[PDB]
Design a protein around this ligand. Sequence first.
Ligand SMILES: CS(=O)(=O)N1CCC(NC(=O)N[C@]23C[C@H]4C[C@H](C[C@H](C4)C2)C3)CC1
Ligand SMILES: CS(=O)(=O)N1CCC(NC(=O)N[C@]23C[C@H]4C[C@H](C[C@H](C4)C2)C3)CC1
Lengths: 546, 546
Amino acid sequence: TLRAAVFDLDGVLALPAVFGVLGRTEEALALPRGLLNDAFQKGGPEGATTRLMKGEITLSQWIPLMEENCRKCSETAKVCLPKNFSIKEIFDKAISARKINRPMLQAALMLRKKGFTTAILTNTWLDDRAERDGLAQLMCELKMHFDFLIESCQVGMVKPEPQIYKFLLDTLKASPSEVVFLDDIGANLKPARDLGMVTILVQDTDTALKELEKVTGIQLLNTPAPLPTSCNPSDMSHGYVTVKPRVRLHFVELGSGPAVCLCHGFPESWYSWRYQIPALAQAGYRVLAMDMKGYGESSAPPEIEEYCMEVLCKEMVTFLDKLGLSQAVFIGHDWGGMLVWYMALFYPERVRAVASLNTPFIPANPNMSPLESIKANPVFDYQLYFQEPGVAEAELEQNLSRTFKSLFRASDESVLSMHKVCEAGGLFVNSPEEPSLSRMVTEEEIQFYVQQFKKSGFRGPLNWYRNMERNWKWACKSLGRKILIPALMVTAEKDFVLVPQMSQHMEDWIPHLKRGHIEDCGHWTQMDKPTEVNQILIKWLDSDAR
Amino acid sequence: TLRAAVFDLDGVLALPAVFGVLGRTEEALALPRGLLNDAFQKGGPEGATTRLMKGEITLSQWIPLMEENCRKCSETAKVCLPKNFSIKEIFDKAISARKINRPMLQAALMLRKKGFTTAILTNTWLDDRAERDGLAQLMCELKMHFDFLIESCQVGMVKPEPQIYKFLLDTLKASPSEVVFLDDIGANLKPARDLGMVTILVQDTDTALKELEKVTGIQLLNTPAPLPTSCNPSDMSHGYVTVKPRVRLHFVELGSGPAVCLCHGFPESWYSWRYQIPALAQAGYRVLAMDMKGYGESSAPPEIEEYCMEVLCKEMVTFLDKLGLSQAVFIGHDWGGMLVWYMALFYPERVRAVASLNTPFIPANPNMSPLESIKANPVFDYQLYFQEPGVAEAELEQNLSRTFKSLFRASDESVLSMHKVCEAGGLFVNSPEEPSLSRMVTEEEIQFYVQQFKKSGFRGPLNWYRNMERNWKWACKSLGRKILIPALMVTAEKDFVLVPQMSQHMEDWIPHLKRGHIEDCGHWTQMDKPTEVNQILIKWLDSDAR
Ligand SMILES: CS(=O)(=O)N1CCC(NC(=O)N[C@]23C[C@H]4C[C@H](C[C@H](C4)C2)C3)CC1
Ligand SMILES: CS(=O)(=O)N1CCC(NC(=O)N[C@]23C[C@H]4C[C@H](C[C@H](C4)C2)C3)CC1
């Protein structure tokens, strides 16, 4: 019975194949059929291409050798190579044109999710071209979805030599009968077959996947739309910056390019952006997913005033200073969304662009107490419950698993009614002791939040709500200003606290404001609708933030 | 007696002043003298410029108000503003033209080094222009050299209002008589004088610095060339990546732009690059200064084979994978220089560019044992002493302070003779018990290395020398290759181990190789000649690495 799946790169995980480019070049230049492909394979195992595939020579060293083989081939075929014939040009173009075959990767992802050991076995070269980064990026994106990547040029062995197959089996720790092997080259598939492995000759992806699902007994074709890539906390780069003597800020970092600072809500973690971190990095950005003050690995001082917007924003500026960042794009959700509008109002020179999920920008009312304002809205009643130091902590800290299972629910699974929370004396007074697992979260994801909250609890997080008068006074200083930097407001249809209509008057203060809207989405935007969050954010980043 | 120095930004720490641009614009456009400067200050404390300087409005909100004042001024002066008159254009150009007045910053740096509390007190605005990043970068570079930065638009007070002076004194925790205040505007200097502060009207920098050194009794003018900015370990962003189950890699990170990976030598730290980290970040690069395997906060497994070049390089590739980096420029010194040439030979697609300080690239001799090769060179004799597990550890770990004080010495201070180290039975057998402090290092810098080495000692670091046969076998696989990616070789005149002549045959393997050479420089290149290392590296990075 099968437990491992092996995939080739060219013509299997990446399309179009390089072999298909040499053929297309012959057709385009009106060269004799197979002339280029013949020069490419000249001398077979003793040839320059074998030396290249084994790692004896680099791609740049190979270009002149291929040129000589092409001249030799044209001499025998009694033909002439065109005036400006260039192998460098042909290969640069071929390599650049090659993209990931998404449904093949999806099938590999599914087999791995169902327990398979997945591997990439490829005949490749050591790329030293000026444009090598494209291929490096491709390999980077691909390799992280697999248990092993076996490259001919690194192992000094090549397909179809029998030793590379015995090497593959040794790294898989699997007998041939337990392995599926997919290849577009019949000759390279032959030694795997001879060893007793299940083999698939890949021509078109659809037929290959039919053969693959028939042989594994796992649905790979016509499958539901998959979730975006998530994060394994232990595989991330973890960063730490001291912003002041008793305060350290933790963050997870991924990708290269313009700095994108992610700011979570209450009661969350850097991990609330797990479905956005890989996507934004992949889109050409350097992601900095924060553990906000009072959360996870960041410091959680006990004093209420350590959590007023003025100090939180100042500390985020210091965070940029210490990292050597003159700017970052600030993307926030919930309480993070509020911080982010305040970063744009008080430090526009430090904010490349600003985006908020669910949280609208509403200017302070100088004629009314924030206490009065909160009482005017019945959904904002649970905020009065959060005021008394200790009361909400005791309930939230009592059973951590219960807390996150009760809170982190999709729009159609609600267990909480935020009207009369004070009257009823708590958020979970009509919630079960053992809530069911929401469709948005796995048991393991809940246990990550439980472990994070075991360090500091709910004092620091609840203190974000305990600075109303202080935040109101500070916000009143910005009443004459406008947000004129690039800005995005994302509303969530089914968020019954941060309702889309609460954002209706935003253009009076943010005239150039851009919008996004997510149908059938509750309060937990990022995990509720990850695919659509990523699509809105990426489109806005490439257009307005660079 | 003086203990604090306060500096204005415009016309003091940054030149040319904005006031000087409005005047130059009038002259260039043949406008009535002072017309623009008059519109700029229209309405005084009730005017739009005061509202802007107090943070009531942003710069973009101010542009139209300045335009109305300019129209009003031209109406009264019975003149006409030109066809395409633009305040946005004038101010963009002015702000962009403004650079740091380096000798003023140098004097501030010296006063701070001699115990002074330094501060920037400036009348400024909340910048929301599309081109605000330039100014953000300027402020970033400047602010880190001072104890305090007081901005009018953040405090809601403005010069020359007396309250900002009383605010300045409160943040300095100093009485007026203990403060020097430098300003280019006489009116803004007047309230500081009235309070009893020492004041300096800054016209030309030279005269201002003469007044400043005369009043402080500290040499600020005609001073020796200063060292580049160094790092305070506790003010850095510290990163951690798990590359495999028992191995974690630590790094310090600073700046934005192309990733530059710094790789130290034996027996060093990320801190050996302290004079390069701020400089390279300032030059437009994202610096990743490594704690190499076996050092500081990185894991130090005991097994010898965990330190062969093959595993060290593979782990550096994984480090890139986990950080989401398709490429980095690799800059190495000593053992780090060797790793870096091997990263270019085995993973060119991952290396944007490669640079080595002191360490040459010498291909393996397939006809000779690395043991034979090391015996052929008498300077490489101390390497035989390092072979026996435990012997060199015991001597190096005996007294940590002695170890670093004995090793980290300039070319004219040597205490070690590496010929007959085995015969004499140790590196420090003719070295004093209490070595003097070298001119290159402070006592505090030695104590940083002592604390770092207390965690894991010398086993892991010495294990880098214990893989000769393994490294030789692996290197022999690359004998047919060439380094064809951008490459820099930096030689140090007075390095008596890694002598410049050892690098003489490098173009046979690296044809496009670029060179740098440092006169009167020993083995500890980075701290020996920091200014010249930074100049060579920055010039090569901007030309060949982007
Ligand atoms: C001042 S504001 O309007 O920006 N703002 C900050 C964010 C806050 N968010 C919030 O309170 N979220 C929760 C998240 C869950 C669900 C519900 C109750 C409890 C637990 C707090 C709303 C609403 C008010
Ligand atoms: C194989 S190599 O030629 O690249 N190589 C690695 C780096 C090594 N460097 C080195 O041994 N440096 C030290 C640094 C001080 C001073 C002296 C003795 C001891 C302590 C080792 C040289 C020389 C050989």
